Design a protein around this ligand. Structure first.
Ligand SMILES: [K+]
Ligand SMILES: [K+]
Ligand SMILES: [K+]
Ligand SMILES: [K+]
Ligand SMILES: [K+]
Ligand SMILES: [K+]
Ligand SMILES: [K+]
Ligand SMILES: [K+]
Ligand SMILES: [K+]
Ligand SMILES: [K+]
Ligand SMILES: [K+]
Ligand SMILES: [K+]
Ligand SMILES: [K+]
Ligand SMILES: [K+]
Ligand SMILES: [K+]
Ligand SMILES: [K+]
Ligand SMILES: [K+]
Ligand SMILES: [K+]
Ligand SMILES: [K+]
Ligand SMILES: [K+]
Ligand SMILES: [K+]
Ligand SMILES: [K+]
Ligand SMILES: [K+]
Ligand SMILES: [K+]
Ligand SMILES: [K+]
Ligand SMILES: [K+]
Ligand SMILES: [K+]
Ligand SMILES: [K+]
Ligand SMILES: [K+]
Ligand SMILES: [K+]
Ligand SMILES: [K+]
Ligand SMILES: [K+]
Ligand SMILES: [Mg+2]
Ligand SMILES: [Mg+2]
Ligand SMILES: [Mg+2]
Ligand SMILES: [Mg+2]
Ligand SMILES: [Mg+2]
Ligand SMILES: [Mg+2]
Ligand SMILES: [Mg+2]
Ligand SMILES: [Mg+2]
Ligand SMILES: [Mg+2]
Ligand SMILES: [Mg+2]
Ligand SMILES: [Mg+2]
Ligand SMILES: [Mg+2]
Ligand SMILES: [Mg+2]
Ligand SMILES: [Mg+2]
Ligand SMILES: [Mg+2]
Ligand SMILES: [Mg+2]
Ligand SMILES: [Mg+2]
Ligand SMILES: [Mg+2]
Ligand SMILES: [Mg+2]
Ligand SMILES: [Mg+2]
Ligand SMILES: [Mg+2]
Ligand SMILES: [Mg+2]
Ligand SMILES: [Mg+2]
Ligand SMILES: [Mg+2]
Ligand SMILES: [Mg+2]
Ligand SMILES: [Mg+2]
Ligand SMILES: [Mg+2]
Ligand SMILES: [Mg+2]
Ligand SMILES: [Mg+2]
Ligand SMILES: [Mg+2]
Ligand SMILES: [Mg+2]
Ligand SMILES: [Mg+2]
Ligand SMILES: [Mg+2]
Ligand SMILES: [Mg+2]
Ligand SMILES: [Mg+2]
Ligand SMILES: [Mg+2]
Ligand SMILES: [Mg+2]
Ligand SMILES: [Mg+2]
Lengths: 173, 159, 217
RNA sequence: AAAGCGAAUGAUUAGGGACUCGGGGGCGAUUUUUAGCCUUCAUCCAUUCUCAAACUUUAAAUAUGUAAGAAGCCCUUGUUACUUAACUGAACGUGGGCAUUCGAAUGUAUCGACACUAGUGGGCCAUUUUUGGUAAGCAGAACUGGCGAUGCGGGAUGAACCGAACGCGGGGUUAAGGUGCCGGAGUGGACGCUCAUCAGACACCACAAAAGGCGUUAGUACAUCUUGACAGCAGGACGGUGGC
RNA sequence: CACAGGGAUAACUGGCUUGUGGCGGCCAAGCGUUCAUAGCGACGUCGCUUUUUGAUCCUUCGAUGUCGGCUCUUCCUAUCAUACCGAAGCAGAAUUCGGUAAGCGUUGGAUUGUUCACCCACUAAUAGGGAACGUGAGCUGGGUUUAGACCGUCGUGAGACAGGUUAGUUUUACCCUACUGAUGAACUCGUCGCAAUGGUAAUUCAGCUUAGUACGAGAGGAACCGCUGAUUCAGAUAAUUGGU
């Protein structure tokens, strides 16, 4: 519930030498619409010669997942900055929505590469339709046939306020 | 105590520009000035008489005296905690009439006619400026102007 | 003499070149910048490799000379005298100073301490930026491994961090490999000494036709 | 500031074309300027790799001068020894006309002028910009904010840092900072990484580098493989031809 | 020689820095009979330390006793010897490079006031440093640095010299703490016991045998076990010898 995917459409301000300017559309992941629009101008400034003071926003809409109850495999392309230089990566995730996949990606990059939110560009998010499109071995073991496994050494849940138990707890639940 | 001469530090300010040496255009000597005009000062390096001090280069003042070949101008100078009134004599090669008050002198005569035209007709008008206001609502059509979808690009080495 | 290089690493002063205001500077240590078969035609050496800076610092003339010698020896040994062309692309113009306390005061007395401490020239360094190119090599495409190893070996003589980048151009030209071939097929390039010149279609018609006969045919 | 040098003034790397009467060395009789055959420097021409506090064709950001009416605008015409060939002008005005709107925004929690006099005239610190010096808790400047002259909550301590400036009390909520115990408040929730016989643990700040690891984790590129790849084990390994 | 002051300002410790001094690494042209790395390391380049000397002037000028030696305790390791080991361009003997390791030692003298130095001789060895450049109410007073005196150079002179020489008063503990020892109120007076915590101790060499053996062409030439003594240190004791 931290992120949502938005559609943002923007335009250069019309002038007499060019009425009816072109329209550009981007897909932005953001926690709210105030930072969705700020993110839009950031990316457009890097591609076209437009600013916020010489343009305007046309439309903002929320894109919802079409089947948020079906398990899917996702692939993501991204570009990030390390302490010296920039690099490209491709990672994979398994969940039920595009928003869930992006949230897991941001946590994963912070843990394994110490990359902050401010140094990551998302290039493309694609749902992998065929089971033959899975590349990473940590996903392949999850799409194996006839999967099943037990849960050994499970610690029982005990109220914090209850100190001084009178029996030795078990771990076979 | 460092060196402090009259023209110290004027290497670039008092110099004529590139490809702008030689003869002075003669329309400079044909203008007329009256007591109460508003002029700005700009020193010409090729004339060494009636030169003003480097402080007044780039200032604007009011004429108070007219003589055979020069004018007297009044400027206000800030000295720490106060302003002081200065009176300098400048040859006309260093002065020039200013467009600072022309916008005001244009609105005054334009307001006069609009007021009299409206009074003769019978519908009131505004007669004073307003700052830029926020835009209004409008509709933008998508017909034959389909939007183009953009995405960020991957990193690559140029050299 | 020759204080350690740790003491003059950062670009802390404005550029201080030799001129009519500071006189009496020693000659720089490095004097030769082009090595190898430096007059081959453009079409012989299509591959180029660069050594690029990654910091904002100063490199000394001694360090530049040491790295040039180290890379030259390896290329000659494994590629021959006529299998490469090497160029150093950083020239030292900034002069550093030293305040001789012992020389001016030790056994000479006169004035001691920090009084009148403006120094005398000692050496020369090159000021470099992030992404600036330091050394370039052009050779055939079968000597890719040799060129990479030569530049990797020579960077142990430099302070700071450097990278090696394989260019996407043709030789030393500012032209991508594929687009250079198309321009040559169209006949718009002509061979100069070890380099080329290009046609602009903005001169007088007689001279342009004479210099680029293949273009108009 | 940035930028420029196939743009002036300076600095600077490398080839090519044209040239000989400029130099040097030579070869066809060194004959010979015979530019005969060459030759290397030099010169001119189109190109080529790097620079400038006391260089420049260009050229920001931040800052800076003046104006936004009634002491204004327009119509007519009175004085002068100044000016004009000339009541032609120049300055100062009578009379008349113009809110049907006195001519950007916001504030006005403080308008103008005068009199008499105290203390001070050793300063220091910080972000950004900066000079000398190898550097310094060193020495010197610009704009602004602080301490001195100032308590209170944090940084265990700590003139200058973060939060916030103070009459005597009661209730509520917070800032910076915290919630295993010392200690008021979570042994709170989610996903990972790390095993150190020298672990690590919060701005100012109380330190660590070049260089290495088949420790572990994620990623980039190329090549081989169910027409059987890597490892291990098992078998074979032929005529000219003992090549010239 | 005098007075008013100054830590706004030098001469000693301490504090920041580390140019210079000292110590340690990285790369690999080359040395090494062939052979980059047994043992070394040119051109370059990254560090550490505060037992050198500089740079600064924060504390002390109503005073923190200013060289060296003698005496005595403890600490550091960048290891001279001793224990047990890895490597060699290690046949044996002798040597060289490296690891764990500060438990235990590291001397008797001629000249010099010396710190530093240079010789003779013994030894397993004669390593490097700190503690206000440890240590003057602990000593000493040879040097330096008051007043007397001589010489050389300098100055007209009074006088000067980080130049030589000779003679020159070293004060107070009975107070608090620290330390070394010695008594002791309260719960009846005694006899015999336990042991938390604190302290802790040993050291190096020689002779005989192994053996003229192993190894080696020869010249040369070991070691483990076993036996008997001695150096430095510690705790006691007085039959005998010596001193009083
Ligand atoms: K000056
Ligand atoms: K002095
Ligand atoms: K390097
Ligand atoms: K430019
Ligand atoms: K130039
Ligand atoms: K302006
Ligand atoms: K007149
Ligand atoms: K005063
Ligand atoms: K005063
Ligand atoms: K002061
Ligand atoms: K200071
Ligand atoms: K505090
Ligand atoms: K927990
Ligand atoms: K790794
Ligand atoms: K004092
Ligand atoms: K003081
Ligand atoms: K040092
Ligand atoms: K020290
Ligand atoms: K020191
Ligand atoms: K001092
Ligand atoms: K004192
Ligand atoms: K002694
Ligand atoms: K002391
Ligand atoms: K003493
Ligand atoms: K004496
Ligand atoms: K005597
Ligand atoms: K006492
Ligand atoms: K013990
Ligand atoms: K014991
Ligand atoms: K005894
Ligand atoms: K007895
Ligand atoms: K007796
Ligand atoms: Mg000046
Ligand atoms: Mg004159
Ligand atoms: Mg400087
Ligand atoms: Mg510049
Ligand atoms: Mg004073
Ligand atoms: Mg200062
Ligand atoms: Mg000071
Ligand atoms: Mg004060
Ligand atoms: Mg305060
Ligand atoms: Mg407090
Ligand atoms: Mg702290
Ligand atoms: Mg309260
Ligand atoms: Mg917490
Ligand atoms: Mg509590
Ligand atoms: Mg590293
Ligand atoms: Mg196989
Ligand atoms: Mg005094
Ligand atoms: Mg002081
Ligand atoms: Mg050193
Ligand atoms: Mg060799
Ligand atoms: Mg060396
Ligand atoms: Mg005192
Ligand atoms: Mg004392
Ligand atoms: Mg005393
Ligand atoms: Mg050690
Ligand atoms: Mg050893
Ligand atoms: Mg003695
Ligand atoms: Mg010391
Ligand atoms: Mg002492
Ligand atoms: Mg004492
Ligand atoms: Mg004496
Ligand atoms: Mg005397
Ligand atoms: Mg006397
Ligand atoms: Mg005399
Ligand atoms: Mg005494
Ligand atoms: Mg014990
Ligand atoms: Mg034998
Ligand atoms: Mg007796």
């Amino acid at each position: 519930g931290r992120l949502q995917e938005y559609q943002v459409i923007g335009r250069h301000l019309p002038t007499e030498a060019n009425p009816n300017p072109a329209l550009y559309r981007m897909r932005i992941f953001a926690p709210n619409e105030v930072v969705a629009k700020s993110r839009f101008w950031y990316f457009l400034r890097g591609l076209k010669k437009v600013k916020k003071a010489t343009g305007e926003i046309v439309s903002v809409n929320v894109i919802s997942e079409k089947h948020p109850l079906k398990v899917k495999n996702f692939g993501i392309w991204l570009r990030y900055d390390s302490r010296s230089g920039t690099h490209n990566m491709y990672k994979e995730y398994r969940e039920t929505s595009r928003v869930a996949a992006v949230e897991a990606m941001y946590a994963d990059m912070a843990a394994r590469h110490r990359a902050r939110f401010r140094s990551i560009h998302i290039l493309k998010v694609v749902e992998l339709e065929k089971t033959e499109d899975v590349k990473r071995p940590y996903i392949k073991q999850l799409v194996a046939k006839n999967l099943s496994f037990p849960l050994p050494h499970r610690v029982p849940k005990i109220s914090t306020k209850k100190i001084f138990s009178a029996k030795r707890p078990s771990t076979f639940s | 105590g460092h060196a402090a001469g009259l023209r110290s530090g004027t290497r670039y300010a008092f110099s004529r520009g590139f490809r702008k040496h030689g003869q002075i255009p003669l329309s400079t000597y044909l203008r007329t000035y009256r007591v109460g005009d508003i002029v700005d000062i700009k020193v010409n390096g090729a004339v060494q008489k009636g030169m003003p001090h480097k402080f007044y280069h780039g200032k604007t003042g009011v004429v108070y005296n007219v003589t055979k070949s020069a004018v007297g101008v009044i400027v206000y100078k800030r000295v720490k905690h106060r302003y002081i009134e200065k009176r300098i004599n400048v040859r006309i090669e260093h002065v020039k009439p200013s467009r600072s008050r022309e916008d005001f002198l244009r609105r005054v005569k334009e307001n006069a006619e609009l007021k009299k035209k409206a009074k003769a007709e019978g519908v009131p008008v505004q007669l004073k400026r307003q700052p830029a206001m926020p835009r209004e609502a409008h509709t933008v059509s998508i017909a034959d102007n389909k939007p183009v979808t953009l995405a960020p690009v991957a990193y690559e080495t140029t050299i | 003499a020759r204080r350690p290089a740790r003491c003059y690493r950062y670009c802390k002063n404005k550029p201080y070149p030799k001129s009519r205001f500071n006189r009496g500077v020693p000659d720089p240590k490095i004097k030769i910048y082009d090595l190898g078969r430096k007059r081959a035609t453009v079409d012989d050496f299509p591959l180029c490799v660069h050594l690029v800076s990654n910091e904002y610092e100063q490199l000394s003339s001694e360090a530049l000379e040491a790295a040039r010698i180290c890379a030259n020896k390896y290329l000659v040994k494994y590629a021959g005298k006529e299998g490469f062309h090497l160029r150093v692309r950083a020239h030292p113009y900034h002069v550093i100073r030293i305040n001789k306390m012992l020389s001016c005061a030790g056994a000479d007395r006169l004035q001691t301490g920090m009084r009148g401490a403006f120094g005398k020239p000692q050496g020369t360094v090159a000021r470099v930026d992030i992404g600036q190119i330091l050394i370039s090599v052009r050779t055939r495409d079968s000597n890719r491994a040799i060129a990479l190893e030569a530049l990797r070996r020579c960077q142990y003589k430099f302070p700071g961090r450097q990278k090696i980048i394989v260019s996407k151009n043709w030789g030393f030209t500012p032209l991508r490999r594929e687009e250079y071939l198309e321009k040559k097929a169209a006949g718009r390039v002509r061979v100069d000494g070890a380099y080329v010149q290009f046609l602009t279609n903005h001169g007088n018609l007689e001279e342009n036709m004479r210099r680029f006969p293949d273009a108009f045919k």
